[model samples]
Target: TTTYTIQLTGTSSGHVYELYHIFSGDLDANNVLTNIEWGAGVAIGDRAKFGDASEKAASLSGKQNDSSEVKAFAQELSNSLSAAGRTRVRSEQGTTTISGLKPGYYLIKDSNGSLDNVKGQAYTSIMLQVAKDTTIAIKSDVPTLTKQVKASNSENYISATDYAIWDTVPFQITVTLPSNYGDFSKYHFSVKDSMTSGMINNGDIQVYLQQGGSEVAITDSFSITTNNGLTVSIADLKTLPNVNENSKIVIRYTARLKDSATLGTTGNSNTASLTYSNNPNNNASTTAQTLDSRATVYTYRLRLTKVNERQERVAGAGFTLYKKINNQYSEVRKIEASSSSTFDFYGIKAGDYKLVESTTPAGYNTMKDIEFTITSTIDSTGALTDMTSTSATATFETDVNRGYINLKVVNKQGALLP
Candidate 1:
């Protein structure tokens, strides 16, 4: 007759946990429990109600199916498991105890998910000593960090994965926190963001709670630590009206990508990791990982207007556009000086581009290659931005076209160079 305590930690702050014994029966210091029947449960009712959590766990091992049937079944089964006993159960607090066992080899399995609720990993089992209290951990039992998102520009929202810095790179990072603080002030939560040298921090980070579709402000403090990126100490949320334990914490802010902020098929990254005082001592390391407007940071084309010292669209001139690809210039399009239109070379990533005159207008001088670049820059992306280096040749300007570069390849009057 002996008992021991096992402490568990690092759950999502509010989810329930269950512990199960994998094998049935008696034990010695080691050896002998053959004819082991494969089933799991604490009682007849829990068994009938939940159908072997350990068994269901076996069915889900390394298996994946997007079917609605599995989804519905798993969800219902998990709800049932949460309904009752499992030898040891804990919520909010993650401590469990096991008793009445002799010294022998033993195994324990731990998991979390909605009955559709889970990942397929169980903890390593342990061996016990006669009349000795032993402690063990449920490793890999923790939930994964939530995915991060951004919407810096009005019309654009970017994900950490599959992202492209297409606009002013004006950005807003939406951080999602778990809704299980019985007391907001009792816990620790903050974010430390380090912007890459390729980008610049614009101003104060606007802190807000994403409540009911509106970005309501939460007076969390922020400071520009010597790190100079942005270190934010989050609000306890006691001041904002209607703040609750179930409310979500979301914050956003602005940034400006530098002139060298654009790149071709390269990953431009900026991130804010979180720190939560999960412990009473305020020492929980967190990843508060964490979108957009339009007008557009995309001007991937060049428009050269030909004029005889006067600004006007002209004729009889030609230039070869050597677009940069794999760091080498290759002929892509021609600006037949007869006409120019915006949006050519559409959907090209930010990179180097040059326009060389293949044939000058009948009255114009053969100009050198019109070297320029197209890339993500610190323009007004919201209508406001991400830290990503985009090597851009933002030279053109027009009220309508945002214009690529205003290179007036003018011909000297009566100048037909032989």
Candidate 2:
């Protein structure tokens, strides 16, 4: 068994900003990955574990402090860790932890917040490996910093209008496990309604199932009805025989207006796991699991603004909605800005999302990426209000001037300027 002690530090000059650190390694040697972990702390603070390292590789945990002093300290820690080859992970708030590592090289990074004033601020950390009972310290350099901001926000329309969908629709799909014996109860499904205040146009939604290695989409063509709420019961899912216990369902749905205009669309909900079991009371060999019938839809309002030097919202710039999942970002839909420079991401799933500025009209420079996190819940009217931050501001900044000077002057002496 090998043990290691990791330390982190951050160094910034002027303003303070939030920082994050991610640690990963391979604990198992069979070439199969194991024991990867992430640890985070303020620049001068001590390092701590993120979560349980025994779980699996690729797991992450985090923390944050918005106070000016804490932010400065965190920045210092980030700088120190970066110098040690650890890459900053993308997140808000304070320190984070990642466990389940494989013995190999890892990275340190911090790419979310602004690091302007602290031009030379550095994040540092040290890695030590323990073999048997002896602990050994390894000196490493900072990993290259990579910007993981969403580049674009554009996708086909799913739903357009604001309409009441089934409060909650319970459904189960059949699936096969890796063991491949009899069919197991493992597939489950959920629906999300949109909350845009527009005429209903598109009524399409995406479906996803969580597999072992990745989340697989079952279908990209699931359609929703206009005005009428959706109904996805056990019988409705029985038609699809490929879903199983290892499968979880996710739906990206929308509600449209009566005139075929799009009102709003929901983001992908949490991967609802599917379970199959024997219904002894009903004398059935296999029965689909049931979910709550009171699920609700999410709504969004759209806004827009211009870009500025400080990356603040100007006005009159167009923005689009994009979805981030499984480490990939894709466009979901587009909406023009209202007067307030805010665009609502209605009906989004309860997960993290990346909002990208797809296009910047002629005078404005396109802004960078923005992220949002949504939670699951029902609204006051028994409708699901799965929405994100009401507004996103796009800041624009002025560029520095650059002028050229002639080095040679005939009348004057050909010498450097005094």
Candidate 3:
């Protein structure tokens, strides 16, 4: 008969605790089984049960009584398993013996019932495969683990501040992924701001890049996952140049959970205006040209009449005008009808300017893109005293004179109507 031995060792605080031995061998593996199986007779000190369960009799009395109790328990265990035709051999100290087993495969387990009635205690088993005569050693230790996060590629760029600047240039951001961690397969990314906070959902998150703010050079809606790391590119968000130095592009992300909902704890990276040059040439710096507040003021009277087909004026119509300067438009004044169909726009600036009609009364068609150029210059006192002889008239076309139809019926009698 061939015999094999297996050794199990645990290291802690420079001291080795020896567990009772039961060994088994299987021909298929090198490390088959090399650990001890404690039986019912094993003496468990205060670690197993409290002293209240046993009598507080003097030293010798308690010791002897406890030993007898342990031995009886062991006997009961041996009887229980022996009745099933599998008997366990007991060792003097913490060792046991098993014999007459075929060499194919075998497992060592506690047959003397040492683990009975124990709560929350666990045991580990080691595997050993023995051929011919062999000795195997097993060691156990605690393991340590670590994790980190990094950006896979460049950061995502978003538009900020005024649209005019963003419409003219391109912007971008970058992120790197950390090493040695869990998978980033379920990460979600997005851009957010004060006005678009709660309104932006997971679907709204996108990556884009912008050049000169006026045009979207590129846009990508594809999702990303990082094995090592990845970079995402984005086009400008606005259709015009809105970027300035105060503009910021923020990249934010969240981790997806099993429920398909994203966890709100997010990480963010940010980038500033790529072309935020504070050159004075970009801004119009004009010396304050003072004009006297008491200048001659010119009044232009505009008549807007909404009439039916009969050419009679419709009362209670309203309208507003805006003035355009240097390609920018500003709201100047508003007009409402009281009795006549005339609107007077008072006070004037002399440079070449145009008037825009903003709104028309409820029943009237809104006058859109209406422009009138004024070429008269104001005096040094900031007043235009010219009452221009020229007047402009805006007339609405409608048919109001169509006569109503009259119907009369008589039952075969053409006498005077009843």
Candidate 4:
């Protein structure tokens, strides 16, 4: 039999204990463990336990159990009996010792306090390995991590999505620490966000700490730093400060979909990682990453080509894009076609537009303005990336099916005008 000790360290008082065990050797390839036959043991001798492999193998050498059921039971019973050891008795002054154990590997765990065992959830309880008479020191916050939230604008906002190349959209990132996320209100907490080049506004990053669902401007305490043009870090860093439970960290910045921003297409993807101190260490070794969130980004476009009845490409055609402003069609863009037939409106947003052939190629009749809309397939404004992120006065954005404006124009023939 072997003996082991477990002690609760640190200045926390009155910490109770509830422990359970699972044989380390019984675990399978997936870490799933086999249930050992709890009811099969015989006191063959004082020092020799009956469940040893040798005793079971001796049965094989002699006469195996006539039935496989009996054989399987015997096998597992011996497997469980390969050890003799015991541990613990009461919360005796922060320490307990377990004696009379077999010299085999076993795991002692805090059953009631550990994980709820659901998918995507970590074990809330604690576990430790007991390998042949060992002493382990335990900590309270050993089982915790910062739970990351998503990026959005408001109740219906999602981040890193579609808009016109002319749009400047606002993106907000929320770094939420689930209720009672970890121990110690005094801890290091920060978020680092990264985006692709030319995908966001150059400056003006605003940060707020929301407590209990209310916005509290702590800009004086919150420090924000931008790297190059695509990354920003929000922190109170330099040392571990403090925060509260049920508190949220919110960051706001504008993302402008430049003409160059559309190349990354479904890119311009923004990802944010969280660093918080939940450790007991006191040194600058306080940085720890708990979780990350990425915004679902998207894009849209407009392709136009002017053709004659003879199927000849017409060059130098001027057109205007009229977007609805204050409930009226206000011209937003003017394109004077070059020697090429196709006119590209890169990163166009989802909405109604009037394409007026203001000036057609020489001798070609102006094709008159036609109406087209860039509409999303969704019923309501869905993902934040799908709807407009910019202001109504600025660039309104959204997604839509592919849009192609093919205009056919006819020219009057000399002496044949009808």
Candidate 5:
């Protein structure tokens, strides 16, 4: 009989592991496993479950540590074998080594409830035969989640953008599978999106599966629920047809910017996250979730003051703002000047706009329509850094912090005779 050294590294501290010798054997001069028999505490009934250790070792060859069949075998052996004579070890300083062990086939398992309440950690168990000194690293995989919003046709997926009130905003969430996804028999994946009080979900949920840079629409394989925010739940991702480690799940939906939406730099924030099955050795009942991904939508405002040639605020004037699209101006909103001689337009996006004098004060000449542009500088964090107004007839200044354009238009008093 020969002794072997088992070294386990890359383990998280305070995590517990148990080792069981399922089969005892020796390597012959020709480097073949010979004389295999049950070791230590294997029960009589368990012996029948694993008939031949030599054949089992041969079957396990060339298989990855996360192989589904190998994982199943390791889990089954862990459950069936009694722990009375098993060697238990806890990782300290990320390394654990057990020496003076007989040359045999062993099953290593992470103790159940050992990783409970631990964030960003999963369980990986393996079965290996030790004909020589062996070194194994505890390997686990976790998926990543990302969220983006569609601003327009020109700007597809972005972290932050500007949209007018009542605008329908399109959003997307992508969940990428881990490289070792096939190790799990079943995987549960769900994406949940929560919008601020100023936004409303439009219930336009669509799901797609992307593989090899190609996407196919997925229908009837998932469910959408709004009871606890918006959620796209896939009960078992492994059951999807042709799903593999390279597959990515994409979800799209729409939300409307309501009148109550937060304006300016604070913006309307929408947050999303992904919840996924974490343990390869167990079903999807245990889960871990990614950090929240957030996107922002912003809207701005304008205040126009009516005045005569003397540059004094004049009342009883009305104006309508039109958005310039394709050289055609479409009416966005209108406002009638109050006694304060100031009119306000709310919920305007950054673009070329024309201000028309819809109603002129009595006994005054109607002013010419003013064509102006509102430009904004947004930073990488989706915050408005600067705002400016461009116009020939009307002079203007911008309140960058408040996202407002203060503009003034002149009105000439009608003469007795032209």
Candidate 6:
């Protein structure tokens, strides 16, 4: 009779683990078992309880630790094995041990979700070993998440971006997998996102598995649903062909900034979270989720007050707004203060803009184009901290708290050019 010790390390901080003796047999110098028997007090001598673990483990021919066949056997056992076990230990500082075990085959599992009640901690896949004085590293950790938006004016992805109403805003949700990703036979992954009332989903969602610097599209293995918000879920990631243990799953989609969106510094915000398979010993439904990762979209308004050289509010003034793009300006919109000297330009973003006095007041000359640059500073929490403009001719005043930019332009009285 021979005895061995099994030690587990690198476990999640507060999780309980259970040890199961699945197979018992006499081992030669090689870790192969002959005259195999069912382990004591497990599965009650019924192979059906664990999908014939003893029968399958014995078929590995002393190479169980080095062959893919071991994974198949371990997966089947994980799916059907029971938690009524031979030894149980609570991990302390990520280490635990079981001593004086007969040399055969052993399995380790996170105690079912009921015992390990901490949320957001994932259960390790079935850890198995051929009995020796060996120490195994437990494979589980909480997944991390990040959320971003494609800037309306640039190609970069960031936590906050400014957009105009009715413009399409793109969003990206990234989830890094638990460290022991490949040990599980099946994995469930999903992203649930909530957007403010100012945005509407555009139904163009794409999923990808990003490994290192490259990404591979994942189309068939997931389903997307949109109600008040968007939900993207996959029942099992094992069906994905190109994923590796280190891959990050990304969800990308577009939304339109509706007319109802919030204006100014109180930007329209969106948040997303990832719900994933947390317990490998249980079904995929036994899950945990990441905290809310957030992104913000903001739109601003500019109030233009037209006045003559006398500083009187002049009516019948027409203006055209042109946004600067690549050193050139393109017309965005036109408005006429036919009745009111102060009219507003709605749904503008942060960028260089030109306000052209297309039509002068009845007796005033058209002012040279007011070339101004709208700039904003935001905090890490995605709140606008300050808004400013760079122009010498125009008086630019902004209120970050109220989210508005007020500009005053002066025109001298003169005859208009025919």
Give the number of the best model, judged by TM-score.
Answer: 5
Please, what are the lDDT tens digits per residue for candidate 5 over residues 1-418?
5787788766667667777777788866654567777777466577777777667767776786657677767767766776754778887656778787777777776677787656556665354445357676655556777788886435579887877763688888888887657767888888888865677888778899888879888856888888887888988987895887788888888887776677677777878888888777645378878788898877777887778888887988989889888989998888765565888776667788899889898778988988988776778776777767888777788776666778876778876785
Return whichever of 1 and 5 wins on lDDT.
5
Q: Candidates' lDDT values, in order?
A: 0.41, 0.33, 0.27, 0.47, 0.75, 0.76
What is candidate 2's TM-score against the reference?
Answer: 0.24
lDDT (Cα) of model 6: 0.76
Residue 29 accuracy (lDDT) in model 1: 48
Ten-residue segment with the worst summed lDDT in candidate 4?
116-125
Candidate 1's displacement at residue 362, Å, is 11
Query: Candidate 4, residue 7: CA error in Å?
Result: 20
TM-score of 6: 0.77
What's each prediction's TM-score? 0.38, 0.24, 0.19, 0.55, 0.78, 0.77
Name the runs in model 2 displaced over 4 angstroms.
Answer: 1-295, 305-316, 336-346, 377-418
lDDT by residue (tens digit), candidate 6, 198-247 = 88878788998888788888866788887646888888887885675788
Ranking, TM-score, top scorer first? 5, 6, 4, 1, 2, 3
TM-score of 4: 0.55
Write model 1 residue lDDT over 167-190, tens digit each, in one string.
234555444443333312344455
Give me the displacement of residue 272 in model 4, in angstroms.
0.9
Q: Compared to the true structure, candidate 3 yields what TM-score?
A: 0.19
Worst 10 residues of 6 by lDDT: 111-120
User: For residues 1-418, what per-residue lDDT tens digits would candidate 3 score against the true structure?
Assistant: 4444433323122222222221222333543332222222223332133232123111212233125453343233322221222234332323223444334222222322343333211111212122223432222221111111121121323222101100121222322111111111111222212111111123233333333443332234433333323323222222223422222332333321121111111111122111111111112111111111110112222334444334555545445555555687666566654554444333322233333434343444444444444333233433322312211432222111110111110112123676
Better of 3 and 6 by TM-score: 6
Supply the global lDDT for candidate 1: 0.41
